[PDB]
Amino acid sequence: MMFHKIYIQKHDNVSILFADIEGFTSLASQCTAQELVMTLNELFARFDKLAAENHCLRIKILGDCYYCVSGLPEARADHAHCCVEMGMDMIEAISLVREMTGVNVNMRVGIHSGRVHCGVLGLRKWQFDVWSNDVTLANHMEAGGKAGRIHITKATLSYLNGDYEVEPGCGGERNAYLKEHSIETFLIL
Amino acid sequence: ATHRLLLLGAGESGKSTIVKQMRILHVGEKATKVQDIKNNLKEAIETIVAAMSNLVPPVELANPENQFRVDYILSVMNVPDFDFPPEFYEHAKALWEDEGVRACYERSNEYQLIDCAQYFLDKIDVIKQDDYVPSDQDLLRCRVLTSGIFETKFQVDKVNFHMFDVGGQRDERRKWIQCFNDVTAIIFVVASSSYNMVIREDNQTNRLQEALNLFKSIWNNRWLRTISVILFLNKQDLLAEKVLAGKSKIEDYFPEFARYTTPEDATPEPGEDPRVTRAKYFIRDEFLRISTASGDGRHYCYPHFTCAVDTENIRRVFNDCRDIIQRMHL
Amino acid sequence: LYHQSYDCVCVMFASIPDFKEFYTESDVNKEGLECLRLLNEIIADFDDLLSKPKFSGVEKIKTIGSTYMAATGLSARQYMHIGTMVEFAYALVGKLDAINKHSFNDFKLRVGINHGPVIAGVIGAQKPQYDIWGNTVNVASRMDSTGVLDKIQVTEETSLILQTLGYTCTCRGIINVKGKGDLKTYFVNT
Numbered sequence A: 001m002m003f004h005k006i007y008i009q010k011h012d013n014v015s016i017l018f019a020d021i022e023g024f025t026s027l028a029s030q031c032t033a034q035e036l037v038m039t040l041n042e043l044f045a046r047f048d049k050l051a052a053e054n055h056c057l058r059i060k061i062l063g064d065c066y067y068c069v070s071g072l073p074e075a076r077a078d079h080a081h082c083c084v085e086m087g088m089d090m091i092e093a094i095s096l097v098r099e100m101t102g103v104n105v106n107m108r109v110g111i112h113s114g115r116v117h118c119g120v121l122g123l124r125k126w127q128f129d130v131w132s133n134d135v136t137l138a139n140h141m142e143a144g145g146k147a148g149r150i151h152i153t154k155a156t157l158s159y160l161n162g163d164y165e166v167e168p169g170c171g172g173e174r175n176a177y178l179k180e181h182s183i184e185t186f187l188i189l
Numbered sequence B: 001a002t003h004r005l006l007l008l009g010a011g012e013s014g015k016s017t018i019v020k021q022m023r024i025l026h027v028g029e030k031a032t033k034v035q036d037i038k039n040n041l042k043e044a045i046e047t048i049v050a051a052m053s054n055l056v057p058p059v060e061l062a063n064p065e066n067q068f069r070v071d072y073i074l075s076v077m078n079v080p081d082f083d084f085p086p087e088f089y090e091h092a093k094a095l096w097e098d099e100g101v102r103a104c105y106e107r108s109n110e111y112q113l114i115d116c117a118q119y120f121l122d123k124i125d126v127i128k129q130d131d132y133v134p135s136d137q138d139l140l141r142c143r144v145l146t147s148g149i150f151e152t153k154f155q156v157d158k159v160n161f162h163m164f165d166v167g168g169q170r171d172e173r174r175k176w177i178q179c180f181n182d183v184t185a186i187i188f189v190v191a192s193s194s195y196n197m198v199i200r201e202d203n204q205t206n207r208l209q210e211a212l213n214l215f216k217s218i219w220n221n222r223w224l225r226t227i228s229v230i231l232f233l234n235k236q237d238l239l240a241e242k243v244l245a246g247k248s249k250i251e252d253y254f255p256e257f258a259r260y261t262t263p264e265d266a267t268p269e270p271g272e273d274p275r276v277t278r279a280k281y282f283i284r285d286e287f288l289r290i291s292t293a294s295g296d297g298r299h300y301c302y303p304h305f306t307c308a309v310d311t312e313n314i315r316r317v318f319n320d321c322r323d324i325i326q327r328m329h330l
Numbered sequence C: 001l002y003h004q005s006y007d008c009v010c011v012m013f014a015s016i017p018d019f020k021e022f023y024t025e026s027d028v029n030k031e032g033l034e035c036l037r038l039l040n041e042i043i044a045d046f047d048d049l050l051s052k053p054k055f056s057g058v059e060k061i062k063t064i065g066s067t068y069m070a071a072t073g074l075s076a077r078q079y080m081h082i083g084t085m086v087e088f089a090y091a092l093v094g095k096l097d098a099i100n101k102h103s104f105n106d107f108k109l110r111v112g113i114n115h116g117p118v119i120a121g122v123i124g125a126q127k128p129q130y131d132i133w134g135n136t137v138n139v140a141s142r143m144d145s146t147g148v149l150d151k152i153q154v155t156e157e158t159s160l161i162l163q164t165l166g167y168t169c170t171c172r173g174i175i176n177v178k179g180k181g182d183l184k185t186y187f188v189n190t
C-alpha cells in the first residue's frame, strides 16, 4: 500500500463538550509554574472522575482547554443529557477549587451534537482524538460561551427532550463563526 | 464488482466530454443547456474580434461596414444578464463571414480561444430560432468549466463503474488527492493538437509541454506506484487538420521531431497520410519515453488515439478499456 | 504520577494555517475522511524525522489539530539545543514541500519558538500522557498564533541565544500579546 494505514472510524449521533479557563495566559504570569500546575491538577483530576460517572469519554487537555464526548465508543441515546449533566458537575467543581485554593479559576462550557471521526494520526506518540465540522463548532461554542454557564446549540436541545429549562444565548453576537454560519444558541438555568 | 475510474489531465483537454460520452452510450435537461451554448457563441465571437487589433502584425477588416458591428460587440461584451436580441445573431453572422475576421481566426493559437468556436459560428441561424433543440453533438461541443469533483455511476454488461471528473487547471488540482486512494485506474487525457498553444494560467508555458510535465508528475507520484494509467491522446481530428494545413510546424516547437521517424510496428488507419501517422505517433512516443523510464513491473501505461466528441470512437475505445481492466484483474 | 521542573527547555509550535480551509465534508471525500488521510501523511513524515541522529534530543509532545508541538532540552557552552530546535523547523519545511509536489498543493509552515523553565509530567486520572506546562509554553504558542508564513518567530531572549550561536535575526516590532501585553519579537534569517 502507498498510503499509511489510517486508524480512524466514523460515528453519528454524539455530543461534544468543551471547557476553557478565562485569562489563563494572564494567570500563568502571576503564580509560579509549580503552583499553577497544582491548581490545574486539582481541577482536572476531579473532572476526569466525574466523566466516568456521567458516561463521558475524556479526549485530551490542550493546556487549559478540557474536552470530552458522550456516545463513544459504544452508542447511547442518553448522550445529550450526559454532557449537560457533565457541565453541571464541572461548573460546581470549579467553584470548590476556587474556594479551597484562592485562585481565580472560571470556565466557559460549550456543547453541540452531531457526527465525528475519531482515532489517531501519525506514527509516534498516539493520542485518541476527534475531528469534524461539528467538533469545530463545539469548540466555537466555548469561545462564544459565558463564564460559569452552559452554552448549547439548537441541535443539542433537540436531543434533550425538554428536561432542562433554557434561555436565549445570543451566541451569534459574541462569536463571528456562530453568526456567519446561522447558529441558534441557548443557555442552561 | 465495481471499478473506480479517475480522469486526469490539464485544463480543456476534453475530460468532461468523455464522461458525457458515457452518459450517451451507457446511461430533459436540454433547455437548461441552451443558455450555455449561447454563451459559448457569444464568448467565441467577442474573443476573435477583440484580438484583431492586438496581434503583431494587426489584422485589418475586409469591409469598413463591419467596424460598426465590431463596436456593437465590444459594447455588449461585459454585460451581466444578456437577453440575446435578434440583432445580436445578425451582427455575429456578418463578422464571421468577413475575411479579416476569418484570417484572425487562422492565427487563433496566438491568443485564447475555445475549441467549439468554428462549430457554433457555422450554425448561428440554427441557434437563433426560439424553438431551437440542441442536438447531441451540440451538447458535446458545449464548453463549461469544472470546479470540484463529480461522481457518475453506470453499468456495462451488469458491471459497475464509478467515474470521477476533476478540474484540470492548476488551482483545481489540489483536490485530486481526494481520489488517489482505492482507485482501479487513472485516465490521463491530453490535447494532442495543442502543440502550438500556451496555457491560460500564464500565457507562456506550452500546452503540450504542460501535459508532459503533469503526466510525468502523475506517473512518478508516491501514492500511485501501483496504479496503471490509460493514456487518451485526445483531439486527433484537429491534429490532422493542423498537420495537413502545413502552416504551424511541429519541429518549430519541438525540435526533436526532425529526428523522429515512424516505427515498424505502426498501425495507420486506412487512407491515413504518412505525415499524419508520423506526427500522431511522435506525440505518443514522447509520453511513453517518460513512462518507460521507471516504475518497472509495478504499473503499466496503455496509449490510445482518441477523439472525445466522436461517440463512435469513444464506444470503441472504452470497450478496449473494459478489456484492460479485466485482462489485468484490476 | 510524578512531576518535574526544568530551567532551559525550547518549545516549538509549527502550524499549517491553510489546512482548515482545505478541509471539506462531502459525499465524495467520504465525509472529510480523505482530507484527514493527507494530514496523516504529513504528520507521518514529520514523525519519522525524529529518527535522524542530528535530532536525537527532540521530543515530540503531541499534535494539536494540525499544529505540531515539540521540544528539546528535556534529556538534560550548552545553548546548542535551542539552535537544534530551529534546525528541526527547517527540516519540517523540507518535508512539507515534498508533500506539496505530490499532492499538487501549496501548504506553508508558520513557526513559533521560545525557551525557558517549564514543568514536565502527567496530569488528571484517565491516561498516562506526558505533557509540559509553564509560561514558556504559553508564550511559545503566541509566537506561532501571531506569526507569518514561512517564518520562524522568536522572542527577544531567544533571539540573543540564537545570535551567539551564529544566527541572524530581524526585529518584527512590538506586538500586544493576549494576556502578556507589549512583547518585542524577532524573525530568523535564512
Ligand SMILES: Nc1nc2c(ncn2[C@@H]2O[C@H](COP(=O)(O)OP(=O)(O)OP(O)(O)=S)[C@@H](O)[C@H]2O)c(=O)[nH]1
Pocket: B010, B011, B012, B013, B014, B015, B016, B017, B018, B115, B116, B140, B141, B142, B143, B144, B145, B146, B166, B167, B168, B169, B234, B235, B236, B237, B238, B306, B307, B308, B309, B310
Ligand atoms: N474537435 C474536438 N474537440 C474536442 C475534443 N475533445 C474535446 N473537445 C472540446 O474541447 C473543449 C474542452 O473540453 P472539456 O471536456 O471541457 O475539457 P476539460 O478537460 O473537461 O476541461 P476542464 O474542466 O478540466 S477546465 C470542449 O469544447 C470539447 O468539446 C476532440 O477530440 N475534438
Ligand SMILES: Nc1ncnc2c1ncn2[C@@H]1O[C@H](CO[P@@](=O)(S)OP(=O)(O)OP(=O)(O)O)[C@@H](O)[C@H]1O
Pocket: A020, A021, A022, A023, A024, A025, A026, A061, A062, A063, A064, C064, C131, C132, C133, C134, C137, C138, C141, C142, C178, C179
Ligand atoms: N501543554 C499544552 N499543550 C497545548 N497548548 C497549551 C499547553 N500549555 C499551554 N497551552 C496554551 O495555552 C493557551 C491558553 O489558552 P488561551 O490563549 S485560550 O488563553 P486565555 O488567556 O485563557 O484566553 P481566554 O480563553 O480568552 O480566556 C493556549 O495557547 C494553549 O495552546
Ligand SMILES: C=C[C@@]1(C)CC(=O)[C@]2(O)[C@@]3(C)[C@@H](O)CCC(C)(C)[C@@H]3[C@H](O)[C@H](OC(C)=O)[C@@]2(C)O1
Pocket: A062, A129, A130, A131, A132, A133, A135, A136, A139, C019, C020, C023, C039, C064, C065, C066, C067
Ligand atoms: C484538521 C482539521 C480540522 C478542521 C478538524 C477539527 O475539528 C480541528 O482539528 C479541531 C477543532 C478539533 O480537533 C478539536 C481540537 C482543536 C485543537 C480545537 C482543533 C483545531 O482547531 C483544528 O484546527 C487547527 C487550527 O489546527 C481543527 C479545526 O482542524
Ligand SMILES: [Cl-]
Pocket: B009, B010, B011, B012, B013, B189, B190, B191, B194, B207, B208, B211
Ligand atoms: Cl492538455
Ligand SMILES: [Mg+2]
Pocket: A020, A021, A024, A062, A063, A064, A065
Ligand atoms: Mg486555551
Ligand SMILES: [Mg+2]
Pocket: B015, B016, B144, B145, B146, B166, B167, B168
Ligand atoms: Mg471540465
Ligand SMILES: [Mn+2]
Pocket: A020, A021, A022, A023, A024, A064
Ligand atoms: Mn483559556
